[PDB]
Design a protein around this nucleic acid. Structure first.
Length: 339
DNA sequence: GCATGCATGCGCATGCATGCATTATGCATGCATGCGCATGCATGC
C-alpha cells in the first residue's frame, strides 16, 4: 500500500542508501544484516535475500503465453538436527502476508478455497484458504515429504501458473495465488546416507523438483573450526529500519533489464548446466532452470540498485546455482557427495 | 229521603332503560427425509 505512493520525503535517507549501494561489500553486509542470531550459512541467507527482492513482473498478455512466474521458490533438504526450521520461523515473522503450513496438518481443500455458508447471514459461497491469503506474500511449507499426492496436485499448478481454477456446483472461478514458496524436506532415512544417491535420498518426482529455483543440500562436514565457532556463538547467545527502508526502496523504484552480454552468458550457462546434469545419479536439468537463472540475475541487479543487469550478476547467479546443489564436490558419474 | 258531587278505583296502550341471543376460517411450526460435500477409516497389492 505505502509503496504505491510518493512518501519518500526522507531525502537524507535516500542519499544515505544510494551512497551505501555504491560500496562494494554491501551485498554481503545485507546477508550479514538479514539475521544476526543465525549461523555461518551465508549462502542460504543470500538466497533468502534474493527471494525478498524478487524478479521483475513483466507483462506477457499480448504474447498469449499467459502469466510468467516472477518469484523465487526455494527448497532446503536436510536432517532434522539443523536450523532450517528456525530460518522458516524468522522469514514468517519478518515479512508481512506470511503463512506457515506443516506436513499432513493441511488438506487439499484447506488450501485454495472451500464452500461455506454464513452462520450469521444466509450464504457466503466461497472462502479463501491458506494459499490465496498468501497472495503477493510468502508461504513456508515444512515436512514437505509427508504431504499426500492430492495436495501436490494443487501445488503443481500453483507453483507455475500463479492461478487457481475451481469448478464445483454453481461455482466456476479463477483466483490469483501469486505466492513464493519456502519448502523444507528431510532424507527418507532421516540421515543423508552417502551410499544412496541424491535422487534416492530425496525421493521426490522430478516434475515437482524442477520448479524449485534453488535447492540447498544441508550436510554435516564435522569440521573442528565449525564446531568451535558454533559452540562459541551459541553459548555467547546467553540498523533494522535502514534495512527495511532500503529493501522497500529497491523493491519499489527500479526495473531491471539486461543486454546481449547477459543473454549470451545465460545461454552458455544453460548449455553448460545441461552438459553437467546429463549424467545419471544427479538431478537433471530442464529449460525452467534458464528462467530461474534469469530471475536470480534480475534479483541481484535489484540488490545493486541497477536498472542494467551486468555479467557480474549472471556469474553470481551461476555461482549460487552451482554451490547450492554441491555439484562441485559431487561425483559426476556415481551421484555421491564427497568431501 | 231524594238529587247531586265526587274522591277512589280499574284496564290497555306507549316510552325507555337493561337485558338476551349469535357465532368457522385462515395461517404458522416442528418432524422426516433427499442431495451435495469434505473428513476419515479400512482394505488391498
Amino acid at each position: 500500500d505505502e509503496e504505491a505512493e510518493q512518501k519518500l520525503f526522507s531525502e537524507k535517507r535516500v542519499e544515505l542508501l544510494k551512497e551505501l549501494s555504491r560500496k562494494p561489500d554491501i551485498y554481503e553486509r545485507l546477508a550479514s544484516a538479514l539475521a544476526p542470531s543465525i549461523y555461518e550459512h551465508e549462502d542460504i541467507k543470500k538466497g533468502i535475500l534474493l527471494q525478498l527482492f524478487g524478479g521483475t513482473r513483466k507483462d506477457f498478455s499480448h504474447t498469449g503465453r499467459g502469466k510468467f512466474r516472477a518469484e523465487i521458490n526455494i527448497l532446503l533438504c536436510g536432517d532434522p538436527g539443523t536450523s532450517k526450521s528456525q530460518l522458516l520461523q524468522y522469514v514468517y515473522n519478518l515479512v508481512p502476508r506470511g503463512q506457515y503450513t506443516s506436513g499432513k496438518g493441511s488438506s487439499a481443500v484447506g488450501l485454495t478455497a472451500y464452500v461455506m455458508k454464513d452462520p450469521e447471514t444466509r450464504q457466503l459461497v466461497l472462502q479463501t484458504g491458506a494459499l490465496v491469503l498468501s497472495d503477493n506474500g510468502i508461504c513456508c511449507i515444512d515436512e514437505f515429504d509427508k504431504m499426500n499426492e492430492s495436495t501436490r496436485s494443487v501445488l503443481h499448478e500453483v507453483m507455475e501458473q500463479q492461478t487457481l481454477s475451481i469448478a464445483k456446483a454453481g461455482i466456476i472461478c479463477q483466483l490469483n495465488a501469486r505466492t513464493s514458496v519456502l519448502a523444507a524436506a528431510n532424507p527418507i532415512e532421516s540421515q543423508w546416507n552417502p551410499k544412496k544417491t541424491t535422487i534416492e535420498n530425496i525421493q521426490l518426482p522430478h516434475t515437482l523438483l524442477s520448479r524449485f529455483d534453488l535447492i540447498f543440500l544441508m550436510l554435516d562436514p564435522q569440521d573442528e573450526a565449525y564446531d568451535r565457532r558454533l559452540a562459541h556463538h551459541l553459548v555467547a547467545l546467553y540498523d533494522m529500519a535502514v534495512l527495511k527502508d532500503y529493501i522497500a526502496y529497491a523493491h519499489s523504484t527500479i526495473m531491471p533489464r539486461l543486454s546481449e552480454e547477459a543473454s549470451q552468458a545465460l545461454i552458455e550457462a544453460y548449455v553448460d548446466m545441461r552438459k553437467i546434469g546429463s549424467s545419471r545419479g544427479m538431478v537433471s536439468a530442464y529449460p525452467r532452470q534458464l528462467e530461474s537463472l534469469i530471475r536470480l540475475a534480475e534479483a541481484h541487479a535489484k540488490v545493486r540498485l541497477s536498472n542494467k543487469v551486468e555479467a557480474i550478476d549472471v556469474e553470481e547467479a551461476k555461482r549460487l546455482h552451482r554451490e547450492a546443489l554441491k555439484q562441485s564436490a559431487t561425483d559426476p558419474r556415481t551421484g555421491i557427495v564427497d568431501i
